[PDB]
Write a structure and sequence with these properties.
Elements: H1 4-14, E1 16-19, H2 21-30, E2 35-39, H3 44-57, E3 61-64, H4 68-74, E4 83-88
Helix pairs in contact: 2-3
GO molecular function: RNA binding; structural constituent of ribosome
Pfam family, one: Ribosomal_L7Ae
Keywords: Ribonucleoprotein, Ribosomal protein
Length: 97
């Protein structure tokens, strides 16, 4: 089993992740990420944008099954985070998602 929270923390600590819908979309447009993670309650059209561009640039996208409050909280942030890009998984096996 993969523990999402453990892997997100491991990737955040030892790799590089970029946070936010707008950056995630931009990374998707550019092919500059290995994985894109979106929250279950991300605005559907934000979710569509990401999927559309990530399919075009060949980036895998994963839906975290929790909300964007929890995603931001997992990341140590006092606000919601509805998506994020894994640019470098670091030591994690997060790209298995």
């Amino acid at each position: 089993m993969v523990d999402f929270a453990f892997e997100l923390k491991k990737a955040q600590d030892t790799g590089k992740i970029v946070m936010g819908a707008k950056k995630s979309i931009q990374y998707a447009k550019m092919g500059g990420a290995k994985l894109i993670i979106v929250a279950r309650n991300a605005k559907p059209d934000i979710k569509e944008d990401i999927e559309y561009y990530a399919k075009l640039s060949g980036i895998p996208v994963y839906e975290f099954e929790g909300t964007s409050v929890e995603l931001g909280t997992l990341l140590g942030k006092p606000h919601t985070v509805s998506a994020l890009a894994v640019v470098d998984p670091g030591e994690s096996r997060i790209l298995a998602l």
